[PDB]
Ligand binder design. Structure first.
Ligand SMILES: CC[C@@H]1C[C@]1(NC(=O)[C@@H]1C[C@@H]2CN1C(=O)[C@H](C(C)(C)C)NC(=O)OCC(C)(C)CCCCc1cccc3c1CN(C3)C(=O)O2)C(=O)NS(=O)(=O)C1CC1
Ligand SMILES: [Zn+2]
Length: 201
């Protein structure tokens, strides 16, 4: 009820990227913790952005965001309704869908977008925040099985990251792990066709 002292949530901040440009996938950090905290408050991020898969953080969480068709997408369960920091200040979401666990902002200048997959292939690859490339067999519209199961710890913080086909097109956005006794045997994703439908609504 004390309106003048009510706080605002900070912006999502890009703090690094998963580099997939070469022969080796690796994580790069582009901003440290103090800079991230400051940038979340101001919403003003003048760092150069590159690549398709960004590592993003709020004050309380860190996860991934993936550019597809000129939109930087991530999970609602990480970003909520937050703005993203940008060179000219905070940028409001252009897509928000809590039912899909999906949000999106206009892709930052300097980023590159993945192309939506039209291959109809079921041999997929999940990219994690540690730049592991994990083979996943597609098992339905929104699920795929890990060829080698992992503790959920290994996948934590990778929501918002891509599932890719063999040619490196975007097939989906990772949202949840299918876990039993802490072991992830499968992953649940937002299919790229669902993003494409969201882009038409
Ligand atoms: C640990 C690596 C996981 C990727 C990850 N995500 C999660 O942790 C999501 C967040 C939350 C729970 N969850 C799970 O993965 C849980 C789990 C393992 C924690 C036990 N699994 C599950 O419920 O399976 C049940 C299943 C039926 C398969 C759900 C299907 C999806 C159904 C669904 C549909 C529509 C909307 C929503 C859902 C689920 N949803 C909203 C939602 O908010 O889920 C993460 O790394 N997050 S993160 O650390 O980056 C975080 C900072 C952002
Ligand atoms: Zn493809």
């Amino acid at each position: 009820s004390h309106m003048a002292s009510m706080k605002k949530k900070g912006s999502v901040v890009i703090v690094g990227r998963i580099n997939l440009s070469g022969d080796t996938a690796y994580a790069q950090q582009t901003r440290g913790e103090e800079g991230c905290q400051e940038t979340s408050q101001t919403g003003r991020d003048k760092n150069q952005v590159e690549g398709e898969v960004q590592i993003v953080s709020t004050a309380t969480q860190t996860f991934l965001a993936t550019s597809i068709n000129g939109v930087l997408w991530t999970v609602y369960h990480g970003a909520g309704t937050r703005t993203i920091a940008s060179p000219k200040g905070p940028v409001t979401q252009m897509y928000t869908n809590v039912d899909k666990d999906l949000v999106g902002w206009q892709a930052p200048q300097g980023s590159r977008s993945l192309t939506p997959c039209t291959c109809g292939s079921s041999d997929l690859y999940l990219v994690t925040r540690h730049a592991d490339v994990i083979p996943v067999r597609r098992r339905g519209d929104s699920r795929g099985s890990l060829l080698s199961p992992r503790p959920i710890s290994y996948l934590k913080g990778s929501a918002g990251g891509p599932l890719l086909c063999p040619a490196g097109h975007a097939v989906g956005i990772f949202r949840a792990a299918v876990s039993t006794r802490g072991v992830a045997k499968a992953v649940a994703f937002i299919p790229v066709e669902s993003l494409e439908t969201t882009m038409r609504s």
